[PDB]
Design a protein around this ligand. Structure first.
Ligand SMILES: *[C@@H]1O[C@H](CO)[C@@H](O[C@@H]2O[C@H](CO)[C@@H](O[C@@H]3O[C@H](CO)[C@@H](O[C@@H]4O[C@H](CO)[C@@H](O[C@H]5O[C@H](CO)[C@@H](O[C@@H]6O[C@H](CO)[C@@H](O)[C@H](O)[C@@H]6O)[C@H](O)[C@@H]5O)[C@H](O)[C@@H]4O)[C@H](O)[C@@H]3O)[C@H](O)[C@H]2NC(C)=O)[C@H](O)[C@H]1NC(C)=O
Ligand SMILES: *[C@@H]1O[C@H](CO)[C@@H](O[C@@H]2O[C@H](CO)[C@@H](O[C@@H]3O[C@H](CO[C@H]4O[C@H](CO)[C@@H](O)[C@H](O)[C@@H]4O)[C@@H](O[C@@H]4O[C@H](CO)[C@@H](O)[C@H](O)[C@@H]4O)[C@H](O)[C@@H]3O)[C@H](O)[C@H]2NC(C)=O)[C@H](O)[C@H]1NC(C)=O
Ligand SMILES: *[C@@H]1O[C@H](CO)[C@@H](O[C@@H]2O[C@H](CO)[C@@H](O)[C@H](O)[C@H]2NC(C)=O)[C@H](O)[C@H]1NC(C)=O
Ligand SMILES: OC[C@H]1O[C@@](CO)(O[C@H]2O[C@H](CO)[C@@H](O)[C@H](O)[C@H]2O)[C@@H](O)[C@@H]1O
Ligand SMILES: [Fe+3]
Ligand SMILES: [Zn+2]
Ligand SMILES: [Zn+2]
Length: 341
């Protein structure tokens, strides 16, 4: 029973998982894959137990029977009376970020520009923006909208990968894992910060966490929030301080998923695990902290306060919501009930 196998995506999450495994006295063990899709297959096969996912993948994993167990919960101002684990999730804001110095660039003049996406199939980095674009465009040719981009998970030979850089030696170009320089929230923001792309599709928090001395990372040390602007749907540009009134959509928090027949056992282990390495864990600051990885968001976003119970034992459809689910469906129509394997 009680031993849980976690699936790490890429060499960086593997090493973090191994530390976790070590400190957990084998209560947690690691399996590794080169992509989130592969990890999902390992979980379906039962060679793995769970992994934390972005809404976009939860849709995929859901169709194949996997279920949401616990969701990430970040520190919020409202609902302060309830404990983190019992507190309702609020979701994150999907935004489009651009350089202020790139005057004249608005949501209505994105065509033929350069884009930076977290990775194909993710919420803020792909489903939301590309979905809105396919609608407003009335075409399924989202592979021709931008001139060049870096969208991890696309054909390496396509313009959708043209801007990706791969690893320190140039290998793994465009792979959907942290080996790729511009992968995920941080990678997509860096892609913008280094003026590789004209626009980055990440989440509100990504801009705050990597500006004004919050990162210390060689490429973000001198980044100032004021040099950035948010593209709203009404064609307007606003400061990153107005995200509540200028976002593309609100996305459901990343959540841990396992097979339905194992969720109970995974839920038990995780709660006890975070009691030890969580934010105010018995051994987090001193020995190991599940939610830290120096702005790299490994296994879990670095801004996670705790993993929270769901309440209402929601199916994957109920967890993502009808709004979002229909959006992905309509966008999928471009690339009707299935399980991709
Ligand atoms: C976009 O993404 C950004 C990054 O994720 C995000 O900014 C992040 O927001 C969080 C909070 O949501 C910030 O962390 C907070 O920082 C403060 C300052 O360091 C911390 O210090 C205090 O902690 C208190 C306890 O929670 C907090 O009290 C809260 O609750 C009280 C009462 O319940 C209440 O206080 C009010 O005070 C009034 C003035 O006197 C008083 O008259 C009134 O009666 C009332 O009681 C407030 O509700 C209050 O929030 C204190 O206020 C302090 O916060 C705090 O613990 C927490 O760590 C992050 O720093 C920030 N990130 C960055 C990079 O800055 C944006 O908000 C996101 N944007 C959107 C649209 O969501
Ligand atoms: C890209 O573009 C596509 C094409 O437009 C778009 O697809 C659609 O998204 C919209 C919004 O997400 C879907 O909206 C619909 O609203 C109908 C009305 O029901 C809502 O409104 C009620 C009153 O305001 C609310 O009380 C209710 O809670 C709900 O919010 C829905 O229909 C009904 O079901 C009722 C059952 O009680 C019934 O009684 C009614 O007669 C009615 O049939 C409807 O089902 C729908 O949700 C719309 O469905 C989507 N269309 C398709 C074809 O899937 C994408 O959203 C868009 N993508 C992006 C990223 O923007
Ligand atoms: C590995 O899992 C086991 C099972 O929970 C833990 O052993 C329990 O630990 C607590 C705290 O020491 C004791 O109160 C229980 O009596 C133990 N036995 C049970 C309930 O089986 C152990 O703490 C975990 N190890 C690590 C390092 O996380
Ligand atoms: O209010 C959102 C909250 O409600 C739940 C049920 O407790 O889901 C509801 O909203 C979904 C989104 O449209 C529906 O698909 C679902 O049937 C409905 O119950 C939670 O899952 C969600 O967090
Ligand atoms: Fe996401
Ligand atoms: Zn909104
Ligand atoms: Zn239900």
């Amino acid at each position: 029973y009680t031993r849980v196998v976690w699936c790490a995506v890429g060499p960086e999450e593997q090493k973090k998982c191994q530390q976790w495994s070590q400190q957990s006295g084998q209560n947690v063990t690691c399996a590794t894959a080169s992509t989130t899709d592969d990890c999902i297959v390992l979980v379906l096969k039962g060679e793995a137990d769970a992994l934390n996912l972005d809404g976009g993948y939860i849709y995929t994993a859901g169709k194949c029977g996997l279920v949401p167990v616990l969701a990430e919960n970040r520190k919020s101002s409202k609902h302060s009376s309830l404990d983190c684990v019992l507190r309702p999730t609020e979701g994150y804001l999907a935004v489009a970020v651009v350089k202020k110095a790139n005057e004249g660039l608005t949501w209505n003049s994105l065509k033929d520009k350069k884009s930076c996406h977290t990775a194909v199939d993710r919420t803020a980095g792909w489903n939301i923006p590309m979905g809105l674009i396919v609608n407003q465009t009335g075409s399924c040719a989202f592979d021709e909208f931008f001139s060049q981009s870096c969208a991890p998970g696309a054909d390496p030979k396509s313009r959708l990968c043209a801007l990706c850089a791969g690893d320190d030696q140039g290998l793994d170009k465009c792979v959907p894992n942290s080996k790729e320089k511009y992968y995920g929230y941080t990678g997509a923001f860096r892609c913008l910060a280094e003026d590789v792309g004209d626009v980055a599709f990440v989440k509100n928090d990504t801009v705050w966490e990597n500006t004004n001395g919050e990162s210390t990372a060689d490429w973000a040390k001198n980044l100032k929030r004021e040099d950035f602007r948010l593209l709203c749907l009404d064609g307007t540009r606003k400061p990153v301080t107005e995200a509540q009134s200028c976002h593309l959509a609100v996305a459901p928090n990343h959540a841990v998923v396992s097979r339905s027949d194992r969720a109970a056992h995974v839920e038990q282990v995780l709660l006890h695990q975070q009691a030890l390495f969580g934010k105010n864990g018995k051994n987090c600051p001193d020995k190991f902290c599940l939610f830290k990885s120096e702005t790299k968001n490994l296994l879990f976003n670095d801004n996670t306060e705790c993993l929270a119970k769901l309440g209402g034992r929601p199916t994957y459809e109920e967890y993502l919501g009808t709004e979002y689910v229909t959006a992905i469906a309509n966008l999928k129509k471009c690339s009707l009930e299935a399980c991709a394997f």
